[PDB]
Paper text:
The glycosyltransferase [name] in [name] (PaWaaG) is involved in the synthesis of the core region of lipopolysaccharides. The hexosyl sugar residue in each of the bacterial species is transferred by a glycosyltransferase (GT) referred to as [name] to form an α-(1→3)-linkage. The PaWaaG monomer displays a typical GT-B fold, consisting of two “Rossmann-like” β/α/β domains.
In order to gain insights into substrate binding in PaWaaG we solved structures of the enzyme in complex with the nucleotide sugars [name]-glucose, [name]-galactose, and [name]-GalNAc in space group P21 to resolutions of 1.95, 2.02, and 2.20 Å, respectively. The PaWaaG-[name]-glucose and PaWaaG-[name]-GalNAc structures on the other hand, only have clear electron density for the relevant nucleotide sugars in one monomer and the second monomer is modeled with [name] only. Inspection of the substrate-binding site shows that the [name] component of the nucleotide sugars superimposes well with UMP from the PaWaaG-UMP structure, as exemplified with PaWaaG-[name]-glucose. In PaWaaG-[name]-glucose there are three hydrogen bond interactions (Glu281, Thr283, and Asn282) which position glucose, whereas there are two additional hydrogen bond interactions (Asp19 and the backbone nitrogen of Ala99) which orient galactose and GalNAc in the PaWaaG-[name]-galactose and PaWaaG-[name]-GalNAc structures, as well as the side-chain nitrogen atom of Asn282 which is in hydrogen bonding distance (3.1 Å) to O4′ of Gal and GalNAc. Interestingly, structural comparisons show that, while the galactose portion of PaWaaG-[name]-galactose superimposes perfectly with the galactose component of GalNAc from PaWaaG-[name]-GalNAc, it occupies a quite different position to the glucose moiety of PaWaaG-[name]-glucose. An interesting point of difference between the structures is the large difference in the binding modes of the glucose and 2F-glucose sugar moieties. In PaWaaG the glucose group is twisted significantly relative to 2F-glucose in EcWaaG, and is supported by hydrogen bonding with the sidechains of Glu281, Asn282, and Thr283. As EcWaaG specifically hydrolyzes [name]-glucose, the EcWaaG-[name]-2F-glucose structure represents productive substrate binding and we therefore speculated that our PaWaaG-[name]-glucose structure indicates nonproductive substrate binding. Solution state NMR experiments revealed that PaWaaG specifically hydrolyzes [name]-GalNAc and that the enzyme binds [name]-glucose but does not hydrolyze it. This indicates that our [name]-GalNAc structure represents productive substrate binding and confirms that the PaWaaG-[name]-glucose structure shows a nonproductive substrate binding mode.
Numbering used by the authors:
A (entry chain B): 1 to 109, 118 to 370
B (entry chain A): 1 to 109, 117 to 370
Write the structure that this text describes.
Amino acid sequence: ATLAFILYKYFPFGGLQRDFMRIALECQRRGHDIRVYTLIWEGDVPDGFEVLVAPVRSIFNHRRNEKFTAWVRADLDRRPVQRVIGFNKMPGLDVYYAADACFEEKAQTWGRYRHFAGYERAVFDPASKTEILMISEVQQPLFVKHYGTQAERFHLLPPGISQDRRAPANAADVRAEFRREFGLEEDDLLLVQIGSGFKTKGLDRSLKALSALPKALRRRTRLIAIGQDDPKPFLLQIAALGLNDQVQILKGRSDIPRFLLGADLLIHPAYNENTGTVLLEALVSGLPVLVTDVCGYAHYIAEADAGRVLPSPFEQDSLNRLLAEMLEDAPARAAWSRNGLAYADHADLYSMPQRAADLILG
Amino acid sequence: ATLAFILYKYFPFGGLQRDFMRIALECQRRGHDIRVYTLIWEGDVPDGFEVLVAPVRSIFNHRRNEKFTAWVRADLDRRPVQRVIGFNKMPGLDVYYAADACFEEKAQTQWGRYRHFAGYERAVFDPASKTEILMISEVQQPLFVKHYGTQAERFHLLPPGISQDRRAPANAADVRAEFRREFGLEEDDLLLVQIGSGFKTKGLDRSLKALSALPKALRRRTRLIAIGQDDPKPFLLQIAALGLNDQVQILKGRSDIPRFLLGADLLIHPAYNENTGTVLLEALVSGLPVLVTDVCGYAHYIAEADAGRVLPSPFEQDSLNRLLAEMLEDAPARAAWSRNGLAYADHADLYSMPQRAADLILG
Ligand SMILES: O=c1ccn([C@@H]2O[C@H](COP(=O)(O)OP(=O)(O)O[C@H]3O[C@H](CO)[C@@H](O)[C@H](O)[C@H]3O)[C@@H](O)[C@H]2O)c(=O)[nH]1
Ligand SMILES: O=c1ccn([C@@H]2O[C@H](COP(=O)(O)OP(=O)(O)O)[C@@H](O)[C@H]2O)c(=O)[nH]1
């Protein structure tokens, strides 16, 4: 009957959050009752969802998290459910959805440390019964290295791109309306950098590449970054590069598909990225992609011939050259667009929720 | 009841893939249930096919393949079948369809990748192995025997399995006329086609060089169309360097290959290596003259049919340049090569592979 889903924060403009929502909605469509435990819920609550916001707090995140697990534990003791699915690492999970990378590995590069390490071990320890849903093949060996987790407990899932990201029948109309709204002409080249966490996702690298463009391309090129981050540190870089009139940083928003159809390139030179849903959202929108090979979903871009993947180790000069080459070549971008849409029509990019629900429900 | 077919990748525009599909459909028509294990399946699943896509990935291709094997065996242990047919070399096959050349030979022409692929090849071809081998390239059989000592009686040479739609139709002249009209080819234009994904291996680099080297008269008349799923950029760079921007197109994969075969004037295929080369025979049965390197397993058909020219090893670009020029300049010879191909296609056994394969698979 009842499934309990646990995540620290729900809000619409995050990958973890969207993945949880799509899994919960799939489970509900199979006739299961949906209960959710969280510290905060922003936006609409779907019909039938029982969302419980925990009345606990602490100025220390780790202490807050401890109070949260105690609260959920107590509620579950009184109000039992059939299965418990967590999207953050903690004790008492039947299933864990591995949105995050391995903490212990990242640590090797103490109250807070012992909290996050312990909560990771609560999932991955060989004595834990938690089943792990993986979305990255890269991180599975790292969990095993640190914890010795049994192989049988890992289940690799494909992507779970939503259908509203696919280019619609009226894609030309949507693009035209967007470009009108933003005052873009046919010779303007709009780069989009999408996702909260601009530092990690390489906005600094993107700005440098834009600034380094040859004169003719530099005049034509604009960038919009979309994320919840404080823009203030980046405005300093923008001013020093002389890009005040060519860069905008927008807050999170729901109409990402418009931007994917209206833009000319998605740029994503992340320092690290477990997967990178926006990479595939661009692909299924027919938006060419420039991405670093460190991203877990970068391989799809190469495999689909839907953009360019920058090889490691990162060189800013190499990014600069590649951006210029992609922007200069309108035929190539037209081909990358066609190739993405073709790939999107046969590739297994959408089935994560069905695969996850099958494993969750048995 | 149930037959298990195993191939790492299914997609429409490949020889291995097309051969697999033809055999599977034939076996189904004889009343068998079809199960397929793969890492990726592009396209519709035929009615009645049980297609299992293994949820396994790795940073190393060869390690992924190892996980795939274990995944398949685990399923077979719980859901057994009558016979297991593989189109890639691996342990646990009752029957292997030799869609690949001898790996050990190429390796000689540790390293984790080498050990994996050598081990999987040995799993099939070792004298102690029970796997029955369906051969499509006779040229490769002595190399497997040299390297592994595989018993002669475990090899079964299949004929080609060219599909009916590649044979020149009654309205061939009209199809050609329409194609050339569409692409804007006049009677004095010469179209080369290079067909098949894997352009580097199949020698598109050599083809473009040969085109560029043509005498001025021929060069100006000659066009090339390449058709495959490859990233075109490395070839577009070469095309620009050779000054052939106005004379070459590189197209993505497509299903209407027959009209290109009928519309073209030569198929060029100077491959570095090629186990067989389906497109060579497709050209032949379309009456399209062929220029091919002798390394291709099906090159001997071109010579036997007298339906083109085979460039002998070792490869020298100058000799390809010369041969292309000689073939393009001689319109009577090309007319003869076309007639010879069509004639050969009317008597040779180029079509029956799937029925032969099913016979051997099902006993
Ligand atoms: O204003 C915005 C910004 C983003 N999004 C959407 O949010 C998702 C972002 O996903 P992704 O590109 O994967 O970014 P992250 O959410 O930062 O994902 C990283 O971080 C997660 C952990 O929080 C991991 O699960 C992922 O594997 C890892 O790539 C996409 O659907 C975007 O369309 C919006 O709808 N609106
Ligand atoms: O765009 C394409 C490219 C190839 N093919 C077919 O794919 C097969 C390629 O087989 P071949 O043995 O020539 O090449 P391989 O797949 O072994 O590299 C032939 O039947 C081609 O007609 C096709 O239908 N469309």
